[PDB]
Coordinates of C-alpha atoms in Angstrom, one line a residue:
Chain A
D1 CA -0.1 0.0 -0.2
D2 CA 1.1 3.7 -0.5
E3 CA -1.2 5.7 1.9
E4 CA -0.8 3.3 4.7
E5 CA 2.8 2.9 4.5
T6 CA 3.0 6.6 4.9
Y7 CA 1.1 7.0 8.0
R8 CA 3.4 4.1 8.9
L9 CA 6.6 5.7 8.6
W10 CA 5.2 8.9 10.2
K11 CA 3.9 7.2 13.0
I12 CA 7.7 5.3 13.2
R13 CA 9.3 8.7 13.2
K14 CA 7.0 10.5 15.7
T15 CA 7.9 7.3 18.0
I16 CA 11.5 8.0 17.6
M17 CA 11.8 11.6 18.1
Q18 CA 9.4 11.7 20.9
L19 CA 12.4 8.5 22.1
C20 CA 14.8 10.9 21.8
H21 CA 13.4 13.7 23.3
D22 CA 12.8 11.4 26.4
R23 CA 16.2 10.2 26.4
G24 CA 17.4 13.7 26.3
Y25 CA 18.5 14.3 23.1
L26 CA 17.4 18.2 22.3
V27 CA 14.5 18.0 19.3
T28 CA 12.3 20.5 17.6
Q29 CA 8.9 21.3 19.4
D30 CA 7.6 21.0 15.9
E31 CA 8.7 18.1 14.6
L32 CA 8.1 16.5 17.8
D33 CA 4.3 16.6 17.2
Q34 CA 4.3 17.5 13.6
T35 CA 1.0 16.4 12.2
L36 CA 1.0 14.0 8.7
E37 CA 0.6 16.8 6.5
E38 CA 4.1 18.2 6.9
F39 CA 5.3 15.1 6.7
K40 CA 3.6 14.3 3.2
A41 CA 4.2 17.6 2.1
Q42 CA 8.2 17.6 2.6
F43 CA 8.8 14.2 1.4
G44 CA 6.4 13.5 -1.1
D45 CA 3.9 11.3 -0.1
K46 CA 4.9 8.2 -2.8
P47 CA 6.8 6.0 -0.3
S48 CA 6.0 2.9 -3.3
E49 CA 9.2 3.4 -5.3
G50 CA 9.2 7.2 -4.6
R51 CA 10.6 10.2 -3.0
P52 CA 9.8 9.3 0.6
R53 CA 12.3 6.3 0.4
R54 CA 13.7 4.8 3.4
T55 CA 17.7 5.6 4.4
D56 CA 16.2 9.2 3.2
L57 CA 14.4 10.1 6.0
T58 CA 17.3 9.3 8.7
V59 CA 17.4 12.0 11.5
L60 CA 20.8 12.8 13.3
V61 CA 20.2 14.8 16.6
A62 CA 23.0 15.8 19.3
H63 CA 22.4 15.2 23.1
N64 CA 20.9 18.5 24.7
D65 CA 24.2 18.7 27.1
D66 CA 27.2 17.4 25.2
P67 CA 26.7 18.3 21.9
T68 CA 29.6 16.2 20.7
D69 CA 27.3 13.1 21.3
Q70 CA 25.0 12.0 18.6
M71 CA 22.9 8.7 17.5
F72 CA 21.5 7.8 14.0
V73 CA 18.6 6.5 13.5
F74 CA 19.2 3.9 10.4
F75 CA 15.9 2.4 8.1
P76 CA 17.6 -0.2 6.0
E77 CA 15.1 -1.4 3.2
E78 CA 16.2 -5.2 3.2
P79 CA 13.1 -7.1 4.8
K80 CA 15.5 -9.3 6.7
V81 CA 19.2 -7.5 7.9
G82 CA 21.5 -9.0 6.9
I83 CA 25.4 -8.6 8.8
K84 CA 26.9 -6.6 5.7
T85 CA 24.2 -3.9 5.9
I86 CA 25.1 -3.7 9.7
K87 CA 28.8 -3.6 8.4
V88 CA 28.4 -1.6 6.4
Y89 CA 26.2 1.3 8.2
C90 CA 29.3 1.0 11.3
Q91 CA 32.0 1.5 8.5
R92 CA 30.6 5.0 7.6
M93 CA 29.7 5.6 11.3
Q94 CA 33.0 5.5 12.0
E95 CA 34.3 8.0 10.2
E96 CA 32.5 10.1 12.9
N97 CA 33.0 10.2 16.8
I98 CA 29.4 9.1 16.9
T99 CA 29.2 6.2 19.3
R100 CA 25.2 5.4 19.8
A101 CA 22.7 4.7 16.9
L102 CA 19.4 3.0 16.3
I103 CA 18.5 0.7 13.7
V104 CA 14.5 0.3 13.0
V105 CA 14.6 -3.3 10.9
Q106 CA 11.9 -4.0 8.8
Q107 CA 11.3 -7.8 10.1
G108 CA 13.9 -9.7 12.3
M109 CA 17.4 -9.7 11.9
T110 CA 18.5 -12.9 11.0
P111 CA 20.3 -14.2 14.3
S112 CA 24.0 -14.1 12.5
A113 CA 23.6 -10.4 12.9
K114 CA 22.4 -9.8 16.6
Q115 CA 26.4 -11.2 17.5
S116 CA 28.0 -9.0 15.4
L117 CA 25.9 -6.3 16.9
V118 CA 26.4 -7.6 20.3
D119 CA 30.3 -7.8 19.3
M120 CA 30.9 -4.2 18.4
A121 CA 29.2 -3.3 21.9
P122 CA 31.9 -1.9 23.9
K123 CA 32.8 0.6 20.8
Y124 CA 29.9 1.2 19.0
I125 CA 26.8 1.1 21.0
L126 CA 24.5 0.4 18.6
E127 CA 20.1 -1.5 19.0
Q128 CA 17.5 -2.3 16.8
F129 CA 13.5 -1.9 16.9
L130 CA 10.6 -3.7 15.2
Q131 CA 9.2 -1.1 13.2
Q132 CA 6.0 -3.0 14.6
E133 CA 6.7 -2.0 18.3
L134 CA 7.4 1.6 17.3
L135 CA 3.8 2.4 15.5
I136 CA 2.6 3.0 19.5
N137 CA 4.8 4.4 22.0
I138 CA 4.6 3.0 25.7
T139 CA 5.6 5.4 27.5
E140 CA 2.0 6.8 27.2
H141 CA 0.1 3.9 28.2
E142 CA -2.0 4.0 31.3
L143 CA -0.4 0.9 32.9
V144 CA 3.1 1.9 31.9
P145 CA 4.3 4.7 35.0
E146 CA 6.7 7.5 34.2
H147 CA 10.4 6.1 34.6
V148 CA 13.5 8.6 35.0
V149 CA 16.5 6.9 34.4
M150 CA 19.2 8.2 37.5
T151 CA 22.4 8.8 37.2
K152 CA 25.2 7.2 39.1
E153 CA 25.7 10.3 41.6
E154 CA 22.5 10.2 42.9
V155 CA 22.6 6.0 42.8
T156 CA 25.2 5.9 44.8
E157 CA 23.1 8.6 47.3
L158 CA 19.9 6.4 47.3
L159 CA 22.2 3.7 48.5
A160 CA 24.1 5.2 50.9
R161 CA 21.0 6.5 52.8
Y162 CA 18.7 3.1 52.7
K163 CA 22.3 1.3 53.9
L164 CA 21.1 -0.6 51.1
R165 CA 23.3 -3.2 48.6
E166 CA 22.3 -2.1 45.2
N167 CA 22.1 -6.1 44.3
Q168 CA 18.9 -5.7 47.0
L169 CA 17.2 -3.5 45.1
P170 CA 14.4 -4.7 42.6
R171 CA 15.4 -6.3 39.1
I172 CA 14.5 -5.4 35.5
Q173 CA 15.7 -7.4 32.9
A174 CA 17.5 -5.0 30.2
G175 CA 14.7 -7.0 27.4
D176 CA 12.0 -5.1 29.0
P177 CA 10.5 -2.6 26.1
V178 CA 10.9 0.4 28.7
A179 CA 14.5 -0.7 29.2
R180 CA 15.1 -0.7 25.6
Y181 CA 13.4 2.3 24.7
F182 CA 15.0 4.4 27.6
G183 CA 18.1 2.5 26.5
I184 CA 19.9 2.4 29.7
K185 CA 22.1 -0.9 30.1
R186 CA 23.3 -3.4 33.0
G187 CA 23.8 -1.8 36.8
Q188 CA 21.7 1.4 36.1
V189 CA 19.1 1.9 38.3
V190 CA 15.7 3.3 37.2
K191 CA 13.4 5.4 39.3
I192 CA 9.6 4.8 38.9
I193 CA 7.3 7.1 40.0
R194 CA 3.4 5.9 40.3
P195 CA 0.1 7.0 41.7
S196 CA -0.6 5.3 45.1
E197 CA -4.6 4.9 46.0
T198 CA -4.0 4.8 49.7
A199 CA -0.6 7.3 49.4
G200 CA -1.4 9.3 46.3
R201 CA 2.1 9.2 45.3
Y202 CA 4.7 6.3 45.9
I203 CA 8.6 5.9 44.3
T204 CA 10.5 2.9 43.9
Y205 CA 13.9 2.0 42.3
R206 CA 14.6 -0.6 40.5
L207 CA 18.6 -2.1 39.1
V208 CA 18.4 -2.9 35.7
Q209 CA 20.1 -6.8 35.6
Chain B
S1 CA -11.8 -14.8 15.8
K2 CA -14.5 -12.5 16.9
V3 CA -15.1 -9.4 17.8
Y4 CA -18.1 -7.7 20.1
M5 CA -18.9 -4.0 19.9
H6 CA -20.8 -3.5 23.7
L7 CA -21.9 -0.5 24.6
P8 CA -20.6 0.6 29.1
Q9 CA -23.4 0.1 31.1
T10 CA -21.2 0.6 34.4
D11 CA -18.4 4.0 35.1
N12 CA -15.6 0.6 34.8
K13 CA -15.5 1.1 31.0
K14 CA -17.4 4.8 30.5
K15 CA -14.9 7.4 29.3
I16 CA -14.6 10.1 31.5
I17 CA -13.6 13.6 30.6
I18 CA -13.2 16.7 33.3
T19 CA -15.8 19.3 32.0
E20 CA -14.9 23.1 31.9
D21 CA -17.3 23.5 34.9
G22 CA -15.8 21.1 36.3
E23 CA -17.6 17.6 36.7
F24 CA -16.8 14.8 35.0
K25 CA -19.8 13.5 33.1
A26 CA -19.3 10.0 32.3
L27 CA -19.5 9.6 28.6
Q28 CA -21.0 6.5 26.6
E29 CA -18.7 5.6 24.0
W30 CA -18.4 2.4 21.6
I31 CA -15.4 -0.3 22.6
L32 CA -14.9 -3.7 21.3
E33 CA -14.7 -7.0 22.9
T34 CA -12.4 -9.6 21.0
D35 CA -11.7 -12.8 21.8
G36 CA -8.1 -13.8 21.3
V37 CA -4.7 -11.9 22.4
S38 CA -2.6 -9.5 20.2
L39 CA -2.6 -6.2 21.8
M40 CA 1.0 -4.9 19.7
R41 CA -1.0 -5.4 16.1
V42 CA -4.4 -4.0 17.5
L43 CA -2.5 -1.0 19.4
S44 CA -1.1 -0.1 15.9
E45 CA -4.7 0.2 14.1
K46 CA -5.9 3.5 13.7
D47 CA -8.6 4.9 15.8
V48 CA -7.8 2.8 18.6
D49 CA -6.7 4.8 21.8
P50 CA -3.1 3.6 22.4
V51 CA -3.6 4.5 26.1
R52 CA -6.6 2.3 27.6
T53 CA -6.8 -0.5 25.6
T54 CA -5.5 -2.8 27.8
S55 CA -5.0 -7.2 27.4
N56 CA -6.6 -8.9 30.1
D57 CA -3.4 -11.4 29.6
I58 CA -0.5 -11.4 31.8
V59 CA 2.0 -12.3 29.8
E60 CA 1.4 -10.6 27.0
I61 CA 1.7 -7.6 28.8
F62 CA 5.1 -8.1 29.7
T63 CA 6.2 -8.6 26.5
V64 CA 5.1 -5.4 25.1
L65 CA 4.4 -2.9 27.6
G66 CA 7.3 -3.7 30.4
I67 CA 7.5 -5.1 33.9
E68 CA 5.5 -2.0 35.4
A69 CA 2.8 -2.6 33.3
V70 CA 2.1 -6.1 34.2
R71 CA 2.5 -5.3 37.8
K72 CA -0.5 -2.8 37.3
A73 CA -2.0 -5.3 34.9
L74 CA -2.0 -8.6 37.3
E75 CA -2.8 -5.9 40.1
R76 CA -6.2 -4.8 38.1
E77 CA -7.3 -8.4 37.2
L78 CA -6.8 -9.4 41.1
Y79 CA -9.0 -7.0 42.4
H80 CA -11.4 -7.7 39.7
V81 CA -12.0 -11.3 40.5
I82 CA -12.0 -11.1 44.2
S83 CA -14.4 -7.8 43.6
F84 CA -16.8 -9.5 42.0
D85 CA -18.7 -11.5 44.4
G86 CA -18.6 -7.6 46.1
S87 CA -16.3 -8.7 48.5
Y88 CA -13.4 -6.3 49.5
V89 CA -10.0 -6.9 49.8
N90 CA -7.6 -4.4 51.6
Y91 CA -5.3 -3.4 48.9
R92 CA -2.1 -3.5 50.7
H93 CA -2.2 -7.5 50.5
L94 CA -2.9 -7.2 46.8
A95 CA 0.1 -4.9 46.3
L96 CA 2.1 -7.1 48.6
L97 CA 1.3 -10.2 46.2
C98 CA 2.1 -8.2 43.1
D99 CA 5.0 -6.6 44.2
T100 CA 6.7 -10.6 45.5
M101 CA 5.5 -11.8 41.9
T102 CA 7.2 -9.0 39.9
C103 CA 10.0 -8.3 42.7
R104 CA 12.7 -10.2 40.4
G105 CA 11.8 -8.4 37.0
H106 CA 10.6 -12.1 35.4
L107 CA 7.3 -13.0 36.4
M108 CA 7.8 -15.6 38.9
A109 CA 5.5 -17.8 39.0
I110 CA 3.2 -19.4 42.6
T111 CA 4.0 -22.8 41.4
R112 CA 7.3 -25.2 42.0
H113 CA 8.8 -23.9 39.3
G114 CA 9.3 -20.6 40.1
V115 CA 9.2 -20.0 43.5
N116 CA 11.7 -23.1 43.9
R117 CA 13.9 -20.7 41.0
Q118 CA 14.9 -18.5 43.2
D119 CA 17.7 -18.4 45.5
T120 CA 16.1 -18.5 48.7
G121 CA 17.8 -21.7 50.5
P122 CA 17.3 -25.0 49.6
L123 CA 16.0 -25.9 53.4
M124 CA 13.1 -23.7 52.0
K125 CA 12.4 -25.0 48.6
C126 CA 12.1 -28.5 50.2
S127 CA 9.2 -27.2 52.4
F128 CA 7.1 -26.2 49.5
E129 CA 7.9 -28.9 46.4
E130 CA 10.2 -31.1 45.2
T131 CA 12.3 -31.8 48.6
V132 CA 14.4 -34.8 46.9
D133 CA 15.2 -32.9 44.0
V134 CA 16.0 -29.7 45.5
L135 CA 18.1 -31.3 48.7
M136 CA 20.2 -33.5 46.0
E137 CA 20.7 -30.4 43.7
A138 CA 22.4 -28.6 47.0
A139 CA 24.2 -31.0 47.6
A140 CA 25.8 -31.9 44.6
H141 CA 26.3 -28.2 44.5
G142 CA 27.1 -27.5 47.5
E143 CA 25.0 -24.5 48.1
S144 CA 24.8 -22.9 51.6
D145 CA 22.1 -21.7 54.1
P146 CA 22.3 -18.6 55.7
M147 CA 19.3 -19.9 58.1
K148 CA 17.5 -16.9 58.2
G149 CA 13.9 -18.1 56.8
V150 CA 11.4 -18.8 58.7
Chain C
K1 CA -3.8 52.1 52.9
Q2 CA -5.7 49.7 51.9
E3 CA -5.9 50.9 48.1
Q4 CA -1.9 51.1 48.6
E5 CA -1.7 47.3 49.0
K6 CA -4.2 46.6 46.3
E7 CA -1.3 48.6 44.0
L8 CA 1.3 45.8 45.5
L9 CA 0.0 43.2 44.3
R10 CA -0.8 44.4 41.1
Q11 CA 2.8 45.6 40.5
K12 CA 3.3 41.5 41.4
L13 CA 1.1 40.6 38.8
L14 CA 2.9 43.0 36.6
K15 CA 6.3 41.5 37.7
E16 CA 5.0 38.0 37.1
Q17 CA 3.7 38.8 33.7
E18 CA 7.1 40.2 32.5
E19 CA 9.0 37.0 34.4
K20 CA 6.4 35.0 32.1
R21 CA 7.4 37.2 28.8
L22 CA 11.4 36.0 29.4
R23 CA 10.4 32.1 29.3
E24 CA 8.5 32.9 26.2
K25 CA 12.0 34.5 25.1
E26 CA 13.8 31.9 26.6
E27 CA 11.4 29.9 24.2
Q28 CA 12.5 32.1 21.4
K29 CA 16.2 31.3 21.4
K30 CA 15.8 27.8 21.9
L31 CA 13.7 27.6 18.7
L32 CA 16.4 30.0 17.0
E33 CA 19.3 28.0 18.5
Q34 CA 17.3 24.4 17.2
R35 CA 17.3 26.0 13.7
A36 CA 21.0 27.7 13.7
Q37 CA 21.8 23.4 14.2
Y38 CA 19.3 22.2 11.7
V39 CA 21.1 24.7 9.2
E40 CA 24.0 22.2 9.3
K41 CA 22.3 19.1 10.0
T42 CA 20.4 19.1 7.0
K43 CA 23.9 18.8 5.2
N44 CA 25.1 15.6 7.0
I45 CA 21.4 14.4 6.0
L46 CA 21.7 14.7 2.7
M47 CA 25.3 13.3 2.3
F48 CA 24.1 10.4 4.1
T49 CA 21.7 9.7 0.9
Chain D
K1 CA 21.6 8.3 66.0
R2 CA 18.7 6.3 66.6
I3 CA 16.3 5.9 63.9
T4 CA 14.1 3.0 64.8
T5 CA 10.5 4.0 66.0
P6 CA 9.8 5.6 69.0
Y7 CA 7.2 3.2 69.8
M8 CA 7.3 -0.1 71.3
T9 CA 5.9 -3.3 68.9
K10 CA 3.3 -5.2 70.3
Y11 CA 5.6 -7.9 69.6
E12 CA 8.5 -6.2 71.7
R13 CA 5.7 -5.8 74.6
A14 CA 5.1 -9.0 74.7
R15 CA 8.5 -10.3 75.0
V16 CA 9.2 -8.0 77.3
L17 CA 6.2 -9.1 79.5
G18 CA 6.8 -12.6 79.3
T19 CA 11.0 -12.6 79.9
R20 CA 10.2 -10.4 83.2
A21 CA 7.5 -12.8 84.0
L22 CA 10.2 -15.7 83.6
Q23 CA 12.5 -13.6 85.9
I24 CA 10.2 -13.0 88.7
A25 CA 9.4 -16.3 88.7
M26 CA 13.2 -17.4 89.5
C27 CA 13.1 -15.6 92.3
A28 CA 14.5 -12.4 90.5
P29 CA 14.0 -9.2 92.6
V30 CA 11.3 -6.9 91.6
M31 CA 11.5 -3.2 90.6
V32 CA 8.5 -2.1 92.3
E33 CA 6.3 -2.5 95.5
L34 CA 3.7 -5.3 95.5
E35 CA -0.1 -4.2 96.7
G36 CA -0.7 -8.0 97.4
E37 CA -0.1 -9.6 94.6
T38 CA 1.9 -13.4 93.5
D39 CA 0.8 -14.2 89.8
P40 CA 4.8 -12.8 88.0
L41 CA 2.8 -11.7 85.0
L42 CA 0.6 -9.5 87.2
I43 CA 3.7 -8.0 88.6
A44 CA 5.7 -8.2 85.7
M45 CA 3.0 -6.3 83.6
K46 CA 2.7 -3.6 87.0
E47 CA 6.2 -3.2 86.5
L48 CA 5.8 -2.2 82.5
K49 CA 3.5 0.4 83.7
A50 CA 5.9 1.5 86.5
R51 CA 8.6 2.0 83.3
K52 CA 11.4 -0.3 85.8
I53 CA 11.7 -3.0 84.0
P54 CA 15.6 -3.9 83.6
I55 CA 15.6 -4.6 80.0
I56 CA 17.2 -2.8 76.9
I57 CA 16.0 -3.9 73.6
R58 CA 18.2 -4.6 71.0
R59 CA 16.8 -3.9 67.6
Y60 CA 18.3 -5.3 64.2
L61 CA 18.6 -3.6 60.7
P62 CA 18.6 -5.3 57.9
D63 CA 22.7 -3.7 56.6
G64 CA 23.5 -5.4 60.4
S65 CA 24.3 -2.8 62.6
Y66 CA 22.0 -2.3 65.5
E67 CA 20.1 0.2 68.0
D68 CA 19.6 -0.4 71.7
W69 CA 17.1 1.0 73.4
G70 CA 15.9 0.8 76.8
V71 CA 12.2 0.3 78.0
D72 CA 12.1 3.1 80.2
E73 CA 13.0 4.9 77.3
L74 CA 10.5 4.2 74.6
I75 CA 7.0 4.7 74.9
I76 CA 5.0 2.1 76.0
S77 CA 2.0 1.6 73.5
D78 CA -0.1 0.0 75.6
Chain E
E1 CA -4.2 27.7 46.3
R2 CA -2.1 24.8 48.2
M3 CA -6.0 23.3 48.3
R4 CA -6.5 24.0 44.5
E5 CA -3.3 22.2 43.8
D6 CA -4.1 19.6 45.9
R7 CA -7.9 19.4 44.3
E8 CA -5.6 18.9 40.7
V9 CA -3.3 16.0 42.2
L10 CA -5.9 13.9 43.1
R11 CA -8.4 14.4 40.2
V12 CA -5.1 13.2 38.0
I13 CA -5.1 10.2 40.9
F14 CA -7.9 9.4 41.5
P15 CA -9.5 9.1 37.9
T16 CA -13.4 8.2 37.3
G17 CA -14.3 10.8 40.3
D18 CA -14.5 8.1 43.5
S19 CA -14.5 9.7 46.5
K20 CA -14.5 6.4 48.4
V21 CA -11.1 5.9 49.8
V22 CA -9.4 4.5 52.6
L23 CA -7.5 6.3 55.1
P24 CA -6.2 5.7 58.8
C25 CA -8.2 8.7 61.0
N26 CA -11.5 9.5 60.6
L27 CA -11.6 12.7 60.7
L28 CA -15.3 13.6 61.0
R29 CA -16.1 11.1 63.8
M30 CA -13.4 12.7 65.1
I31 CA -14.7 16.5 65.2
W32 CA -18.1 14.8 65.6
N33 CA -16.6 13.5 69.1
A34 CA -15.3 17.4 69.9
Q35 CA -18.1 18.8 69.2
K36 CA -20.2 16.7 71.5
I37 CA -17.4 16.8 74.2
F38 CA -16.9 20.3 74.3
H39 CA -20.7 21.6 74.0
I40 CA -19.5 23.3 70.7
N41 CA -23.2 24.6 70.1
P42 CA -23.1 25.4 67.0
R43 CA -25.2 28.2 66.5
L44 CA -23.2 30.8 68.4
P45 CA -20.2 32.5 67.1
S46 CA -16.9 31.1 67.4
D47 CA -13.5 31.5 68.8
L48 CA -11.3 30.3 66.3
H49 CA -9.0 32.5 64.6
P50 CA -8.1 31.2 61.2
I51 CA -5.0 31.4 61.1
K52 CA -4.7 29.3 64.3
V53 CA -6.3 26.6 62.1
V54 CA -3.6 27.1 59.2
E55 CA -0.9 27.0 61.2
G56 CA -1.8 23.9 63.3
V57 CA -2.2 22.4 60.0
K58 CA 1.0 22.3 59.0
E59 CA 2.3 22.1 62.4
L60 CA 0.4 18.5 62.6
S61 CA 1.4 17.8 58.7
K62 CA 5.0 18.4 60.2
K63 CA 4.7 16.0 63.1
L64 CA 2.7 13.3 60.7
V65 CA 6.3 11.4 59.9
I66 CA 7.3 8.4 57.6
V67 CA 10.7 8.1 56.4
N68 CA 12.9 10.0 59.2
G69 CA 15.7 12.0 58.0
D70 CA 16.0 15.5 56.8
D71 CA 17.7 14.1 53.7
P72 CA 16.2 15.8 50.3
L73 CA 15.5 12.5 49.4
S74 CA 14.2 11.5 52.6
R75 CA 11.8 14.4 52.7
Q76 CA 10.8 14.0 49.2
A77 CA 9.5 10.1 50.2
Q78 CA 8.3 11.3 53.7
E79 CA 6.4 14.2 51.6
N80 CA 5.3 11.2 48.5
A81 CA 4.2 8.8 51.7
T82 CA 2.3 10.3 53.6
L83 CA 0.5 12.9 50.4
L84 CA -3.2 12.0 50.0
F85 CA -4.0 11.8 54.1
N86 CA -2.3 15.5 53.9
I87 CA -4.5 16.6 51.4
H88 CA -7.5 15.2 53.2
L89 CA -6.6 16.4 56.1
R90 CA -6.3 20.0 54.2
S91 CA -9.9 19.8 53.2
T92 CA -11.5 18.7 56.4
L93 CA -9.9 21.5 58.2
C94 CA -10.1 24.6 56.4
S95 CA -10.9 27.8 57.3
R96 CA -14.0 28.6 55.5
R97 CA -15.5 24.8 56.9
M98 CA -13.7 25.2 60.6
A99 CA -16.0 28.4 60.8
Chain F
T1 CA -9.5 -23.6 47.0
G2 CA -6.9 -25.2 49.7
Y3 CA -4.0 -25.8 47.6
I4 CA -4.3 -22.2 46.4
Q5 CA -4.1 -21.2 50.2
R6 CA -1.2 -22.9 50.4
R7 CA 1.0 -22.2 47.4
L8 CA -0.2 -18.7 48.0
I9 CA 1.3 -18.9 51.7
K10 CA 4.2 -20.7 50.7
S11 CA 5.6 -18.2 48.4
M12 CA 5.2 -15.5 50.7
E13 CA 5.9 -17.1 54.3
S14 CA 9.3 -15.0 55.0
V15 CA 8.5 -11.5 53.9
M16 CA 8.2 -8.8 56.8
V17 CA 8.8 -5.2 57.9
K18 CA 12.1 -5.0 59.1
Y19 CA 13.0 -1.9 61.6
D20 CA 14.1 0.2 58.8
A21 CA 10.2 0.7 58.1
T22 CA 10.8 -1.1 54.6
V23 CA 9.0 -5.0 53.6
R24 CA 12.4 -7.3 53.2
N25 CA 12.1 -11.2 52.8
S26 CA 14.8 -13.9 53.9
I27 CA 17.3 -12.5 51.1
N28 CA 16.8 -8.6 52.6
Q29 CA 15.9 -8.2 49.2
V30 CA 13.5 -5.0 49.5
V31 CA 9.8 -5.7 48.2
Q32 CA 8.7 -2.1 49.1
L33 CA 10.7 0.3 50.5
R34 CA 6.9 0.9 52.8
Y35 CA 4.4 -1.6 53.8
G36 CA 1.6 -1.2 51.5
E37 CA 3.1 1.9 49.7
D38 CA 2.0 4.1 52.9
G39 CA 3.7 2.0 55.9
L40 CA -0.1 1.9 58.2
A41 CA -1.4 -1.4 59.4
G42 CA -4.1 -2.8 57.7
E43 CA -6.2 -2.7 61.3
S44 CA -6.4 0.8 61.9
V45 CA -7.8 2.1 58.6
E46 CA -11.3 3.2 57.7
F47 CA -13.2 4.0 54.5
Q48 CA -13.9 7.9 53.6
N49 CA -14.6 10.4 51.4
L50 CA -12.9 13.1 49.8

């Protein structure tokens, strides 16, 4: 389809922009909530072998406080992305000092690809998202409360306040969709704020592991 | 498989919007009732509120929303099935059970296959179920019991 | 002497309004900075394809 | 620098009463004038009211530290 | 203003407007007991300056502690834990209602 | 029903409220920074209206 594909692309882009904004990267208040009309008028609304073709709508955004830190958002055309594509992406990334990135794959990448992805991990952080997982922004959902990634200093402050070993805090595996959304990694604590029906508000913490 | 289309009769499903005057003035709006579990493909569809479309299922939510969402959903389901007959159970016990089930990030089943996997202690696992099995595994691996469980 | 106090609270309202104006100007500066970085970033976006 | 609640938890009150009664039954000196009663448990209760029980509670915290409270120091619930 | 802020917090915390909630102390029953003990006779003008009510409510909010400690994190947690009960306390004990 | 009750009881038989005013189990893992998210016994709580 044409119209549906354009709608899907616009939704994916909006989701990614909201995600980057949540993480901390600075983004236009315009593109954060741009409707679909300007999207059509910008790209062409002819994804079917036309102007709005993938890999052309990628967006690079720099962090809020560290203008030196950016992250790509690729959109490979291969339904079953291989390793060669990620290989060339990483090579082309290597020219700049960028370290983080985000891959949007049509369909699930082959298992051989995940091995390569993790292999380059310490040097170039890159993670994957299925468009099917990006068509909706979970963090807005009624059930999913509000997360706040904590800085190391305050994590130490918390642990020293409650005299509690970080091993004793609750756990949240990295695979969790909220974790992958925020880009948290192992050994890092996420603050959770829930409306408590018996206490108004209740704040808890979860160490990723 | 098939989808129903039922107007809400109770507040539990009626839309609620604060009116400029201030009152709540619950609104009556069409809502769909399915018989399968996809969620992920459902929220993506247009004209589908992606903020209130729950799933009624536990395992499904964990793979879509996240462990905190699963805790909230579990609490709501438990409250629904415990208050259906009109009985009332103080919220504290529900919260405590929900947290204990969602303290290790993954949904630990209350069965032998979910509590014995925790590193509580062989003397505590054998009490519940799998006595000889857990004791043999501890002996083979030379585990230790801190002697803190009741 | 009540009229004078009411004038005082009026002045406080005025200074709150100008503070909101300052915040609006801060929004303006953020927008202009974002545009001034977008002008450069579109070049990378173009050369990527 | 004690952070534990300044109230006597019912558990602590029960155990303190029980132990003081056991000590009295073993012919230990009392810490209050007897009005003419012989039950060790009643004597222990009267002492608890008078705040004269020579016992100090050690509350252990999760980390491993502890705090020593004197029965005459914290407020009695009942 | 603080009352309006609390009203907003509740509305965003208890959607669907469910006034029925569980809280430790039954303030209405307490007020009724006070009335019946001190023979308030709610017909004559009372002697209770609203400022007394305001300061008393603030002091009580301070006394009711759950997360002891002056640490900013400790104070945040204390406020979060005893939030709803504080809101109810202010809502029941207001200058107008008390007068 | 009895089997259900047994399984429930065995899964939370060691959780308790330590003197740090927090809910932990035998492994000292914190389950709730305060009992019931408020730190209040369920006995002395009555329904009310806002």
